């Protein structure tokens, strides 16, 4: 149930910030699916079942954020203005990226559908695959991912700033410090794609290939940034 055996969970009691937050996460994953039209005929029913792969990817992504939220409020039981503010910024970013994720998930499901050879339906429905639009695709979703991890780092730093008020022991201080580093390291990969796309060194699709290729090398690039700080 808990991540660390040395951590004393201050947030085992449910609070309003967590109850409100659960409503928002449930609403995000629910409206992502139920924002679709109701099938009126067999043809709509089969069309609507093609949407489960894009939705599974979106849902998997949202609960992973919900889990990190659950663990933070479980660890510190925080309920102050600044925690409320950072918590709202988080849910706000989540909410504005729910329908854009439904879009990206459908788009990539068609692109990976074409590759594997499961389907052969048109991508002209998405509009024009131009360099400017494919660059804005990276910058948009890259800015979204960066912000979510950036906010989780700020939330852990707020708990670190209140370590004495929270009576954090040497193990809990260490966990909190490690959780900040983890979230900044997670926020560093979308920040690096976003910057590469905004400068656009090649002036063509090559830029988008590199920017997209940093997510496939998430684990190794996170280890390089972690290794650079430990080597000094």
């Amino acid at each position: 149930v808990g991540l660390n055996p040395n951590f004393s969970f201050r947030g085992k009691q449910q609070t309003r910030i967590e109850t409100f937050s659960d409503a928002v996460f449930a609403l995000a994953i629910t409206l992502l699916v139920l924002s679709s039209t109701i099938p009126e005929t067999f043809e709509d029913l089969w069309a609507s079942m093609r949407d489960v792969i894009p939705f599974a990817i979106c849902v998997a992504l949202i609960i992973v954020i919900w889990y990190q939220h659950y663990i933070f409020f479980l660890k510190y039981g925080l309920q102050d203005k600044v925690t409320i503010l950072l918590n709202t910024i988080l849910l706000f970013v989540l909410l504005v990226y729910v329908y854009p994720l439904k879009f990206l998930a459908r788009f990539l499901s068609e692109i990976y559908g074409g590759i594997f050879g499961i389907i052969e339906t048109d991508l002209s429905r998405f509009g024009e695959y131009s360099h400017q639009n494919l660059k804005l695709l990276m910058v948009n979703y890259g800015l979204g991912a960066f912000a979510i991890f950036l906010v989780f780092s700020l939330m852990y730093w707020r708990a670190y700033k209140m370590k004495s008020l929270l009576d954090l022991n040497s193990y809990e201080i260490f966990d909190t410090k490690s959780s900040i580093i983890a979230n900044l390291l997670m926020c560093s990969v979308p920040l690096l794609s976003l910057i590469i796309t905004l400068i656009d060194p090649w002036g063509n699709f090559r830029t988008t290939i590199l920017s997209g290729f940093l997510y496939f090398l998430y684990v190794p690039i996170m280890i390089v940034f972690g290794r650079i700080t430990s080597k000094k």
Partner: protein, 221 residues
């Protein structure tokens, strides 16, 4: 988090019949962290601030260990500067207390002097082997240090076997935080003459006899 925001907090607290910070000003071990926060120019900066607190009537002129402790335990002052040993008396009182990093001065941290409580055997004693038995087999043991610690806390004990229990205590974490920002005292024979030079210097500047520039002049000699 900073020394320079205490005067503002004290103005706020004095309106509600409370002090902000009361600590032992007589013993130099308590005033040294502020004096050594920047450093000389650092000792002149740190002490002038301490002198301005007494000059602005934020702190009392003859604040000693007893009236500072009593005032904090009574619930008259919001803060105090003390060691592990002082915690048990606060627990006895009905004061929800916290132990934390010492305030920073001029951005840099206040560097307290770190002490190692140590037991020595008197050269002119016939019970040297009996004292070695007491110190080794009875005191410096998990069970022996627990007995001393439940009376008045020792701080970060030297016994390796106590590492996990010390790490489970939030106040020890704050103690180790300050100990890393400070430095261990050299054991040298001149420490006595040094401490006396700082004890007089701080009292003279606190009462209003010698100037801050003239205090470091007489202390460096």
């Amino acid at each position: 988090k900073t020394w320079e925001e205490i005067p503002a907090l004290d103005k706020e607290l004095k309106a509600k019949g409370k002090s902000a910070l009361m600590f032992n000003l007589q013993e130099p071990y308590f005033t040294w962290p502020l004096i050594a926060a920047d450093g000389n120019a650092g000792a002149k900066a740190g002490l002038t601030f301490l002198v301005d607190l007494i000059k602005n009537k934020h702190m009392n002129a003859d604040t000693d260990y007893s009236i500072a402790e009593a005032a904090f335990n009574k619930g008259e002052t919001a803060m105090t500067i003390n060691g592990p040993w002082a915690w048990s008396n606060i627990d006895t009182s009905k004061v929800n207390y916290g132990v934390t990093v010492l305030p920073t001065f001029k951005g840099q941290p206040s560097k307290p002097f770190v002490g190692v409580l140590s037991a020595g055997i008197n050269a002119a004693s016939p019970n040297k082997e009996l004292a070695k038995e007491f110190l080794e087999n009875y005191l410096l043991t998990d069970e022996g240090l627990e007995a001393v610690n439940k009376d008045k806390p020792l701080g970060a004990v030297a016994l390796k076997s106590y590492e996990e229990e010390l790490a489970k205590d939030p106040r020890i974490a704050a103690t180790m935080e300050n100990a890393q920002k400070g430095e261990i005292m050299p054991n040298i024979p001149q420490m006595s003459a040094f401490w006396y030079a700082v004890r007089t210097a701080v009292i003279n500047a606190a009462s209003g006899r010698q100037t801050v520039d003239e205090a470091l002049k007489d202390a460096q000699t």
